[PDB]
Amino acid sequence: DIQKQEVREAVELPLTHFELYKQIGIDPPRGVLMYGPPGCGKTMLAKAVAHHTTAAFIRVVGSEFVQKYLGEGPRMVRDVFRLAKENAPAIIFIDEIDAIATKRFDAQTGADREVQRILLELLNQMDGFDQNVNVKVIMATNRADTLDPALLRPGRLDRKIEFPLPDRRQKRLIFSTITSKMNLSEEVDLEDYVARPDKISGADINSICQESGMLAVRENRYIVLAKDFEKAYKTV
Template identity: 55%
Template sequence: FRKTLLAKAVAGETNATFISTVGSELVQKFIGEGARIVRELFDLAREKAPSIIFIDEIDAIGAKRMDVGTSGEREVQRTFMQLISEMDGFDPLDDVKVLAATNRIDILDPALLRPGRFDRIIHIDYPSLEDRVEIFKVHTKRVNLHSSVDLHKLAEETEGTTGAEIRHIVIEAGLSAIRRGSKIVEKEDFENAIKTVLTSKAGKTNAYALFV
């Protein structure tokens, strides 16, 4: 969420066409499909230039691989090599810029981070307490909240969460209220939602934006 907003902001500031994809969408089951999608992505970006290509979760295709013995791993490798080829290719990128994002920079193939590829890295920290309060306000604007709900306390309890995760918490809390047969979301609904989201979050690391 934070990474995508940053990429969109860059595109907006430069009046560039914003073309977004997710690394997992480039992982295809059929031979050559992933590489074809990457080629078409860059062809579209050149056609719409000035443009920015944003690849979220690039670790899905750009992680270090010790074994490419399976057909699935070989297909991911083909897709990865096509991405490298497009970034290094004979056709200059000119007015096409490539941004990527990952929560797992530690597992990226070093080939991605070489000069001329993704050689500028920005660490994107989690929202501050004040930021989280504001994010809760945005996502609860149309929610019927019980008087027991204190957004500041919820923000304190959600240190280390992203804007997308806070949105997920609000949705989960609403579903909890529905399951109770209530149209009003109470403190207990949020407490259950926070537990659910933070449990699924376990093991995740900070986010990074990569710029070529």
């Protein structure tokens, strides 16, 4: 309601204006930051933008750039950034930055120091990527206590979307947005199903309702009920 609204207003509203942003040359901050260790997230919004908007999509699970070759870093991030700035307005979804964002150990091992100096180089590149460029860098993580504030500096990641647990409002509207189209009855409840999923963490609630429709699609039960809702809770 405010989470997905911030994802649309922060991602898809300036996305269509890149064809104009190449002309007027005024680029807003592209940094979108998600958070919340209890809630899974990081997939319903990337898929929601992946289906709603028709643009280039470059998803990278984790840190693909941990290759032992120190000189490969600028080639990889330079290739991704050159296909982002040249190929199409690709949306770069960098997830799980906790691995490379914090130094591990063994300072004299100039591999990590050198690739974090490369991280500072591409940091100056994303400083330069605020003017006449079709760049989109959305970011997600689960633990902010180990992240260095260099990436989270004011001016780089200005969209801090918080999602510890799904609030009751998104629960009620995500149940109404699926029971409004499917069959509705009395056994479809919103109070115990707005209170219990607030205690137990559960993602893809809409997909849980669709799987419940896949458990009531047996041509024997015609209206979805709480039996397949709680059964879908204890099974998926």
